Design a protein around this motif. Structure first.
Motif, short mmCIF file in Angstrom:
data_model
loop_
_atom_site.label_atom_id
_atom_site.label_comp_id
_atom_site.label_asym_id
_atom_site.label_seq_id
_atom_site.Cartn_x
_atom_site.Cartn_y
_atom_site.Cartn_z
N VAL A 198 0.84 -1.18 0.00
CA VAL A 198 0.00 0.00 0.00
C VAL A 198 0.89 1.24 0.00
CG1 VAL A 198 -1.81 1.30 1.20
CG2 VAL A 198 -1.89 -1.19 1.16
N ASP A 199 1.95 1.24 0.80
CA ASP A 199 2.87 2.38 0.84
C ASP A 199 3.37 2.64 -0.58
OD1 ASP A 199 2.69 2.45 3.64
OD2 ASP A 199 4.54 1.32 3.91
N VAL A 213 -5.01 5.15 6.24
CA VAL A 213 -4.77 3.73 6.05
C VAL A 213 -4.94 3.06 7.40
CG1 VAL A 213 -3.11 1.96 5.43
CG2 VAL A 213 -3.20 4.06 4.12
N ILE A 214 -5.92 2.16 7.50
CA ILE A 214 -6.15 1.44 8.73
C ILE A 214 -5.37 0.14 8.53
CG2 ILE A 214 -7.82 0.17 10.13
CD1 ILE A 214 -9.91 2.28 9.41
N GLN A 226 3.54 5.94 8.68
CA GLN A 226 3.38 7.35 8.37
C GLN A 226 2.37 7.91 9.35
OE1 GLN A 226 3.84 8.76 4.33
NE2 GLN A 226 1.81 9.72 4.40
N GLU A 227 2.87 8.56 10.40
CA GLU A 227 2.02 9.14 11.43
C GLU A 227 0.97 10.06 10.81
OE1 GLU A 227 3.60 7.63 14.38
OE2 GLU A 227 1.40 7.61 14.52
N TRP A 232 -3.76 2.08 13.50
CA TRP A 232 -3.89 0.67 13.87
C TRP A 232 -5.35 0.28 14.05
CZ3 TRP A 232 -0.13 -2.46 12.92
CH2 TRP A 232 1.22 -2.04 13.06
N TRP A 233 -5.71 -0.86 13.46
CA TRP A 233 -7.07 -1.37 13.55
C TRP A 233 -7.51 -1.48 15.01
CZ3 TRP A 233 -10.63 -3.73 9.86
CH2 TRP A 233 -11.71 -4.38 10.48
#
Ligand SMILES: CC(C)(COP(=O)(O)OP(=O)(O)OC[C@H]1O[C@@H](n2cnc3c(N)ncnc32)[C@H](O)[C@@H]1OP(=O)(O)O)[C@@H](O)C(=O)NCCC(=O)NCCS
Ligand SMILES: CCCOP(=O)(O)OC[C@H]1O[C@@H](n2cnc3c(N)ncnc32)[C@H](O)[C@@H]1O
Ligand SMILES: [Mg+2]
Length: 634
Positions: A198-199, A213-214, A226-227, A232-233
């Motif tokens: 994804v990145d 992005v979860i 990437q803050e 996080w889920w």
């Protein structure tokens, strides 16, 4: 040989031979009455009035069903089952490693879907937004899909096997605002990268719609973060309220999109709405697998494919069934894995694919070694043609000659089963999909569009609409009309070929356009060629499929290198990895044929007919044939 309907299936079947004939006849002559009554299999927040309102007119296709009724897919698959079956297991999760498993009850699944629905909303997701889902075979994938559907958010699931490039192409086209993925997936003991993909996909300068992005921590591997963008889920869902009231969604509100390969161009976003789709999925699932409350159902199809959407989650959950989601592969650690899982969870209905069956059949009795298999009552096959030999092997070794096999033919664009057997109503012919389902009117036409009657063969088309039919191609209704309704006016063209025998049974021979079938996967020849030609050293390419004893078709690619370039082990490796990086490992050619003599027509178009012949083993310059024949002999 015609397999007879077993007495055990005949004593409890929801539909017998007489009932099939009758219901089928009414679904064709009076679909408004038939589908009007059958659509009640779902709970409707507001009843519908009109049932069928469709048209296949040239350049003017319109498909609507139950258009004025409102409902909620999540409520139909969860909420309405809580009061009487909240404790019943909704999803049985079998990890890649057998020591890992879960039994998620309807009440639990519902609670998590509610919490995740609130999570999406608090993040800014609204009805109508597109949410990309790049997830492995884990419960969280179903929770994400159900949550999206619950709030009217159109989800765009992307098979984990697609490359970063392929993922970017889907996001760009759908303008997804969110991407839900995991750090890594687990398959056959190996860890597959997902988050990193994804990145990479997000670095594509054309991707501009993704804001968050979860990420689900499945393996805990070191990944880049990437803050702000990445979340996080676990951290999100635990902060969300498990209280969420389902809102009414229109019957024609978009439910989801699935990018599918076509004869030309890159994959298009096949789009399905809510009403007809859910009705068709639950109806087909129910009658074809002869589902009885208490049955343990297991569809092995990946969640990223239409089969996964329709017969892993939606169809069975809507009916309140216990569905099994397997994380790994059928033959890992050993070829007997599939049957071990069957015994482990007492599966009564197994629905898998010919490729998996062939891969196991290749291992002889090692696939059933040490296993019982007595809990099975129904077997199913989908995705590709299956020869009588593999069909009988499946029927005898897996079903112990006691389970009817349902070979279901259909497509992403049909939403659900089209030509399939009904266990307690139709006698089976090994390798035959048999008769059309309720509301389905198939036909065989020549290349000129003329219908063919009696025992014959030709292009497989559907003369009318059915509830689960795809409504359009995301952002391109015109392509939708041209791709499926221009070849044969007023008819849906599937792109498949088929023959009808003396009994009226259908035998699908395969795609008649340039769509390949690699290990049960739909891939266009054109898209593979573009990917190849995109390489700085490749001038032109021609891809064809060739028979393969296990995967159905292998990918054979004729490649023309630019001048100054020369074949070598390094370039052979680079080109194969180029396709893997451009599309994904599934589209990786098994053979690369270097040639400076591609067969063409005086107009400039390339003739893949002659190429398909040579590759298997069998005119602007007829000289190319002899040269090609020898290069192939080497
Ligand atoms: C042998 C078997 C277990 C898997 O066969 P397969 O589908 O060809 O997949 P393979 O294991 O050969 O994988 C081939 C490549 O695809 C990749 N791949 C396959 N599935 C993947 C997934 N879910 N995620 C990521 N990568 C995946 C593999 O990593 C491999 O690439 P690599 O060699 O570069 O690492 C087969 O018997 C089977 O069960 N196939 C089912 C697939 C199918 O037809 N599904 C539709 C069901 S309707
Ligand atoms: C339906 C699961 C996969 O959907 P997809 O959209 O990826 O591919 C649909 C195509 O798979 C083949 N196909 C599918 N089921 C069968 C089947 N049961 N027999 C023969 N070929 C089949 C047919 O050629 C059809 O055009
Ligand atoms: Mg090039």
């Amino acid at each position: 040989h015609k397999h007879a309907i077993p007495a055990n299936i005949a004593d409890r079947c929801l539909i017998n031979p007489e009932q099939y004939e009758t219901k089928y006849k009414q679904s064709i002559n009076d679909p408004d009455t038939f589908w009007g009554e059958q659509g009640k299999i779902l709970d409707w927040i507001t009843p519908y009035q009109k049932v069928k309102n469709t048209s296949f007119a040239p350049g003017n296709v319109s498909i609507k069903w139950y258009e004025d009724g409102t409902l909620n897919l999540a409520a139909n698959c969860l909420d309405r089952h809580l009061q009487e079956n909240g404790d019943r297991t909704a999803i049985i999760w079998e990890g890649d490693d057998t020591s890992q498993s879960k039994h998620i009850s309807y009440r639990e699944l519902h609670r998590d879907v509610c919490r995740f629905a609130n999570t999406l909303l608090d993040l800014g997701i609204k009805k109508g937004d597109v949410v990309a889902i790049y997830m492995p075979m884990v419960p969280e994938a179903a929770v994400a899909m159900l949550a999206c559907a619950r709030i009217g958010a159109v989800h765009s699931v992307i098979f984990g096997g697609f490359s970063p490039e392929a993922v970017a192409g889907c996001i760009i086209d759908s303008s997804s605002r969110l991407v839900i993925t995991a750090d890594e997936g687990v398959r056959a003991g190996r860890s597959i990268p997902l988050k990193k993909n994804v990145d990479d996909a997000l670095k594509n300068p054309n991707v501009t719609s993704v804001e968050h992005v979860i990420v689900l921590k499945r393996t805990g591997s070191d990944i880049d973060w990437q803050e702000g963008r990445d979340l996080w889920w676990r951290d999100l869902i635990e902060k969300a309220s498990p209280e969420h009231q389902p809102e009414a969604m229109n019957a024609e509100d978009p439910l989801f999109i699935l990018y599918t390969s076509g004869s030309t161009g890159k994959p298009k976003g096949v789009l399905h709405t809510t009403g007809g789709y859910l009705v068709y999925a639950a109806t087909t699932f129910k009658y074809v697998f002869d589902y009885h409350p208490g049955d343990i159902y297991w569809c092995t199809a990946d969640v990223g494919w239409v089969t996964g959407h329709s017969y892993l989650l939606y169809g069975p959950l809507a009916c309140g069934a216990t569905t099994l989601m397997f994380e790994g592969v059928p033959n890992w650690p050993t070829p007997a894995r599939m049957c071990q899982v069957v015994d482990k969870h007492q599966v009564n209905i197994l629905y898998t694919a010919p490729t998996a069956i062939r891969a196991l059949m290749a291992e002889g009795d090692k696939a059933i070694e040490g296993t019982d298999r007595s809990s099975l009552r129904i077997l199913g096959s989908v995705g590709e043609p299956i020869n009588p030999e593999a069909w009988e092997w499946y029927w005898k070794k897996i079903g112990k000659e006691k389970c009817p096999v349902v070979d279901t033919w259909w497509q992403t664009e049909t939403g659900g089963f089209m030509i399939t057997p009904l266990p307690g109503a139709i006698e089976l012919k090994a390798g035959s999909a048999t008769r059309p389902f309720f509301g389905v009117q198939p036909a065989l036409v020549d290349n000129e569009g003329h219908p063919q009657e009696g025992a014959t063969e030709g292009n497989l088309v559907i003369t009318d609409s059915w509830p689960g039919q795809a409504r359009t191609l995301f952002g391109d209704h015109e392509r939708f009309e041209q791709t499926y309704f221009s070849t044969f006016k007023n008819m849906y063209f599937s792109g498949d070929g088929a023959r009808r025998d003396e009994d009226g049974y259908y035998w699908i021979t395969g795609r008649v356009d340039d769509v390949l079938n690699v290990s049960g996967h739909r891939l266009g020849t054109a898209e593979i060629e573009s990917a190849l030609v995109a390489h700085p050293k490749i001038a032109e390419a021609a891809v064809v499929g060739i028979p393969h004893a296990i995967k159905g078709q292998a990918i054979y690619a004729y490649v023309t290198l630019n001048h100054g370039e020369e074949p070598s082990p390094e370039l052979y490796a680079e080109v194969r990895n180029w396709v893997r990086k451009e599309i994904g490992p599934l589209a990786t050619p098994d053979v690369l044929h270097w040639t400076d003599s591609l067969p063409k027509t005086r107009s400039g178009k390339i003739m893949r007919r002659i190429l398909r012949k040579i590759a298997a083993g069998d005119l602007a310059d007829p000289g190319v044939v002899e040269k090609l024949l020898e290069e192939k002999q080497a």
